[PDB]
Design a protein around this ligand. Structure first.
Ligand SMILES: O=C([O-])CC(=O)C(=O)O
Ligand SMILES: O=C([O-])CC(=O)C(=O)O
Lengths: 435, 434
């Protein structure tokens, strides 16, 4: 009723039968072809894996178990007095496929606050990391080191039924999620607040608020942003590098700690994890050059110049997104409400109205709309989080929610080891001369 | 001309042009189909990626740049007074596609010797890790922490050309390889030799010998087994979890340290790199339950009893292979030579005599033959390396050579982000109905 573990135990047999029915009906059905190009092209547009938690709706953007961001914004419980969905409630939705009640989100906050304690060796490790070790590497290493607490690692050697794997994955996942804000905040403080203490977890606060307390922030609106930020970056299908990495490492029966730590290594990749930062570096450089009261005309000209130099507008480059990423839009609406006077926000909204058209005029993408990362950096900066090296850590804490929700389900459903076939160029040249 | 980096610079254009042409003509040739079962079956049988260094024949087993392991044992340089191929030469072969000269292997030994230094924060982290932190976690966290020495991360931030990624990938790879034995030896000593120091690197020893020196071993035949172990575990195609993880993370332009440390997390999984220990624990439970004397009938029985109750013989199957793993056969030949009277060895050999038939008669064995992990533990244990938690660390050190060699080529050839399409069961049902 209130215990997520017992609700999930009741959901797992129905989903297992659903899948078994579909495989028994359609197992041998061909869903696509693999070309030589796809093998060289990083499996692009190859249906490679099953991932239950989120799906890209090609018009309406990401869907969390069927719910769009606007629907989640509407339906998910909020803090007392807040407007922004609690990430707890998003996690519940991912795991259960159902919208939580306020009582379920509240139980989940309490459960995460009670598991949040870090082992001493991790605190020590973190306190001893130098300033030149990037925050993401500190997060990954710390998470790896947390695997000393893994319930799941012990039990496989002990011969626990496969049928029970999901239960230990759940425990480990709940423990990791609870601990991630303490790790993330200790890294923040060590790097940027002279190693002062993160203080104490409040057993009665939601996860985002405990997290902002620990970072050393005391600004209701930043906590509101953080709630929204963690909700919306939580999951984006299974194909992206951080989700795929967690799924791949997870399929070897590595515990949630090792899976996530691997996934963060992947998120730290500058083709996955650095866009927030590149957009902000660009905006800062732009505003300083052209001043904060630049005209549309002069802005449009600057953009035309950048494009004709063979250069991209960072944060504008879409997939199949026939509209603006709803992840952008909810950040925009947030900004419109709470920081409409901010100069850099004003530059962001001005580009929004100008750049799509310029991109359509040019021979480029048929989608010229902005991704989530075009708006994220200006909001964080506004609330005093100016340490751009740390931005991807926030993304990472968010993504824990999606990849761990899916990891529980991968084990509950008994997905096997991910083990595709590779070929060399020489092999593939022969393979095609034959047949 | 002589330096590995220069020889590689000459080879890259040629391979790039040859692929550009291949994808022009044959880019649209279908190599395979995707079925629903493959999506739910972890991509089994699905031609997913290009991986240049090695290719796994299901029937004949692994080839390194077209060379079987027997071919490598013959052709690859050995230490002076040695019979086992140097891992250095395996790496040269993976990187260049060519068998190295003794001079080239000697040069590479010196090169990894000179790069082996650990920064102080990494030493300290290892010295502070508690005893209950698995050695593989230790290895992963230390490698991730070494990413502070990444020249590739620093160069990419300054906007280096795409055409030059492979060069810094190579430097960071050569640095990681050189440092790994030091990291690995520190783990070992901290956990199992009460924190005793690892000593120093000798610049005129090969990589496997410096490593056994740092572990605390002084046994020619132990060094020989290591040289063998580190060659044959080095690479196994792109599709295994450790190589695929490194390739996936690397595709996002993560540096070799983060890519390798991700791989290690994958190698640490029970279905991947912990089978060595799992084999050994099982053989030990078996050896106490009958003893040295057990007959083919008794053993055949015990096996039947195991299968009938739906248990499994550890080390006797594979996702891809469907004959005796050549890496098994290599270790069998070592053992036959250097420890034929070892009781544990005796049991493993009896099992080779018996189990493959039991599995074929039954019928549900897609691969009835042993894989590498059936044989490796008894060799290690025989030389005093009885700390079974640590075995995957050796595999890890070995696997660094294959995945880092491929990572240099993945950047050199400009392989993009790996980004397959995922589906939900609900979405997949609807797509199939369309
Ligand atoms: O960027 C992508 O490809 C999807 C994703 O991971 C994200 O939304 O962050
Ligand atoms: O190839 C596989 O899937 C597993 C394996 O034997 C290896 O990585 O050495």
């Amino acid at each position: 009723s209130t215990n997520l573990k017992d609700i999930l135990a009741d959901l797992i047999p129905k989903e297992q039968a659903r899948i078994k029915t579909f495989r028994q009906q359609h197992g041998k059905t061909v869903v696509g072809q693999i070309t030589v190009d796809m093998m060289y092209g990083g499996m692009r547009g190859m249906k490679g894996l099953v991932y239950e938690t989120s799906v890209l709706d090609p018009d309406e953007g990401i869907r969390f178990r069927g719910f769009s961001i606007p629907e989640c914004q509407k339906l998910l419980p909020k803090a007392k007095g807040g407007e922004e969905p609690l990430p707890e409630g998003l996690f519940w939705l991912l795991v259960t496929g159902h919208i939580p009640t306020e009582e379920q989100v509240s139980w989940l906050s309490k459960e995460w606050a009670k598991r949040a304690a870090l082992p001493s060796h991790v605190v020590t490790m973190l306190d001893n990391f130098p300033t030149n070790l990037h925050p993401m590497s500190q997060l990954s290493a710390a998470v790896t080191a947390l695997n000393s607490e893994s319930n799941f690692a012990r039990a496989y050697a002990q011969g626990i039924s496969r049928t029970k794997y999901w239960e230990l994955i759940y425990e480990d996942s709940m423990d990791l999620i609870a601990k991630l804000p303490c790790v993330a905040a200790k890294i923040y403080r060590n790097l940027y607040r002279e190693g002062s203490g993160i203080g104490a977890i409040d057993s009665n606060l939601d996860w985002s608020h405990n997290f902002t307390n620990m970072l050393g922030y005391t600004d209701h609106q930043f906590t509101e942003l953080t709630r929204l930020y963690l909700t919306i970056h939580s999951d984006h299908e299974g194909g992206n590098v951080s989700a795929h990495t967690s799924h791949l490492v997870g399929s070897a029966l590595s515990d949630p700690y090792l899976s996530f730590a691997a996934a963060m290594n992947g998120l730290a990749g500058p083709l996955h994890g650095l866009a927030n930062q590149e957009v902000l570096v660009w905006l800062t450089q732009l505003q300083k050059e052209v001043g904060k009261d630049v005209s549309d005309e002069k802005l449009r000209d600057y953009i035309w110049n950048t494009l004709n130099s063979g250069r991209v507008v960072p944060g504008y480059g879409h997939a199949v997104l026939r509209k603006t990423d709803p992840r952008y839009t909810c950040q925009r609406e947030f900004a419109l409400k709470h920081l409409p006077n901010d100069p850099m926000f004003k530059l962001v909204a001005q580009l929004y109205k100008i750049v799509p058209n310029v991109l359509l005029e040019q021979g480029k993408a048929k989608n010229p709309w902005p991704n989530v990362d075009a708006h994220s950096g200006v909001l964080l900066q506004y609330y005093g989080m100016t340490e751009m090296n740390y931005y991807t850590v926030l993304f990472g804490v968010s993504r824990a929610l999606g990849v761990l929700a899916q990891l529980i389900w991968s084990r509950a459903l008994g997905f096997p080891l991910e083990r595709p076939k590779s070929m060399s160029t020489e092999g593939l040249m022969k393979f095609v001369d034959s047949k």
